């Protein structure tokens, strides 16, 4: 397939830019990582995760961040977002970032299963090595934001658990922060001009032809009727997928989702493009955005502690 070849060549271009950026970019200081843990009994290299920590721990456990990377469901691995994960860790958080098998080798159901396996691994083994699972920030960027938004709903719903073939994990998400998410991919082939066929191709690979996945491919289809944690929507008017952020706010309002936003206006400049705060941790706006996210997380964690007579 020439379409698959075309999709892959666009990601190999993205991969070259990612490689060059990383060669140059400053690396956050004072962090330790532990790499390449298998989260299940398999030799698939995507079924692995990294853990990150401040080099000096203020306590034995630290509030938890779990990151789902982006890349259009076709690209990336547990290393793609390492500088971002390191940044967040450097601020006194214990951080897990996972790989998941890529399209077209799997479909959405296999990617959701991988993510849940990484979450289940962490419920078993995280606390003994520093993860406070009472305070959990789930975050994802772009396709990773899609995935995070679905995982959040699936975690709350026995029906979706059964449909996606996963079990709930023994912790809750305190906050879900989506960074330039593409949470309504069904909307992609609309406009997209001469790219509609490619966008339709993404959707077919995500669904694997399973009509139940087709009917559950969008945040708008999985949100219905659930009591969810709060969300934070991060991005800006210069995100190539800003329309997806606009569309998601409409779904939030219609479903009484509690949320806050950190949306950069066009006036804040042409550099604030898609996933800028993940790809460029050291920029002042990335710092601001990411600290704001962590502050929002801390505020909710403190309210939870007060509510639970545990302040």
Ligand X SMILES: CCCCCCCC[P@@H](=O)OC[C@@H](COCCCC)OCCCC
What's the rounded Cα separation, in Å, for the pair 239 and 231? 19
Q: Output the smallest distance, CB 142 to ligand X, in A.
A: 3
**Whether the Cβ atoms of residue 231 and residue 252 lie closer than 8 Å to each other:** yes
Looking at residue 101, the DSSP 8-state letter turns out to be P
**Whether the Cβ atoms of residue 164 and residue 154 lie closer than 8 Å to each other:** yes
The smaller minimum CB distance to ligand X, of residues 10 and 246, is found at 10
Residue, CB closest to ligand X = 142
The smaller minimum CB distance to ligand X, of residues 195 and 299, is found at 195
3-class DSSP state of 311:
coil
The number of C-alpha atoms within 13 Å of 46 and in the hemisphere containing its C-beta is: 18
The smaller minimum CB distance to ligand X, of residues 198 and 249, is found at 198
Q: Output the smallest distance, CB 149 to ligand X, in A.
A: 13
Number of neighbouring beta carbons within 10 Å of residue 5: 8
Q: Output the smallest distance, CB 302 to ligand X, in A.
A: 32
Q: Output the smallest distance, CB 125 to ligand X, in A.
A: 27
Binding site for ligand X (CB under 6 A): 10, 14, 70-72, 76, 142-143, 182, 188, 195, 198-199, 202, 240, 274-275
What's the rounded Cα separation, in Å, for the pair 40 and 58? 31
Q: Output the smallest distance, CB 173 to ligand X, in A.
A: 20
Residues 6+ apart with CB under 8 A from 133: 64, 122, 123, 126, 127, 170, 171
The smaller minimum CB distance to ligand X, of residues 54 and 145, is found at 145
What's the rounded Cα separation, in Å, for the pair 131 and 253? 33
DSSP of 120-162: HHHHHHSGGGTEEEEEEEEEEETHHHHHHHHHHHHTT-HHHHH
Give the distance between the most distant pair of CA atoms in the chain.
Answer: 60
Q: Output the smallest distance, CB 195 to ligand X, in A.
A: 5
The smaller minimum CB distance to ligand X, of residues 108 and 300, is found at 108
The smaller minimum CB distance to ligand X, of residues 78 and 135, is found at 78
Nearest residue to 65 (alpha-carbon basis) of 277, 289, 293, 303 = 293
Tokens found for residue 46: 């995507």
Tokens found for residue 180: 């330039």
Q: Output the smallest distance, CB 164 to ligand X, in A.
A: 20
The smaller minimum CB distance to ligand X, of residues 141 and 298, is found at 141
């Amino acid at each position: 397939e020439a379409m698959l070849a075309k999709v892959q060549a666009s990601w190999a271009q993205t991969a070259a830019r990612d490689k060059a950026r990383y060669a140059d970019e400053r690396v956050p200081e004072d962090v330790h990582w532990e790499t390449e843990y298998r989260y299940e009994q398999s030799a698939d290299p995507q079924q692995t995760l990294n853990l990150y920590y401040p080099a000096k721990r203020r306590n034995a456990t630290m509030p938890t961040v779990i990151d789902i990377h982006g890349g259009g469901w076709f690209y990336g691995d547990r290393n793609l977002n390492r500088n971002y994960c390191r940044y967040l860790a450097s601020q006194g958080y214990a951080v897990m970032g996972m790989g998941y098998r890529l399209l077209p080798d799997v479909d959405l159901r296999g990617q959701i299963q991988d993510i849940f396996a990484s979450l289940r691994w962490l419920s078993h083994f995280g606390p003994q090595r520093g993860f406070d699972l009472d305070h959990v920030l789930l975050t994802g960027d772009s396709a990773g934001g899609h995935l995070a938004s679905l995982v959040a709903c699936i975690q709350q719903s026995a029906e979706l658990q059964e449909l996606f073939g996963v079990s709930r994990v023994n912790f809750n998400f305190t906050l879900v922060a989506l960074v330039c998410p593409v949470a309504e991919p069904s909307k992609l082939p609309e406009a997209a001009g001469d790219m509609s066929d490619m966008a339709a191709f993404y959707l077919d690979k995500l669904s694997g032809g399973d009509q139940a996945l087709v009917d559950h491919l969008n945040f708008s289809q999985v949100v219905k009727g659930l009591d969810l944690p709060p969300f934070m929507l991060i991005g800006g008017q210069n995100d190539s997928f800003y329309l997806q952020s606009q569309a998601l706010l409409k779904v939030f309002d219609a479903n009484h989702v509690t949320y806050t936003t950190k949306l950069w206006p066009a006036s804040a400049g042409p550099h604030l493009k898609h996933v800028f705060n993940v790809q460029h941790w050291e920029w002042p706006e990335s710092i601001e955005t990411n600290l704001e996210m962590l502050r929002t997380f801390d505020a909710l964690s403190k309210q939870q502690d007060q509510a639970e007579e545990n302040e």
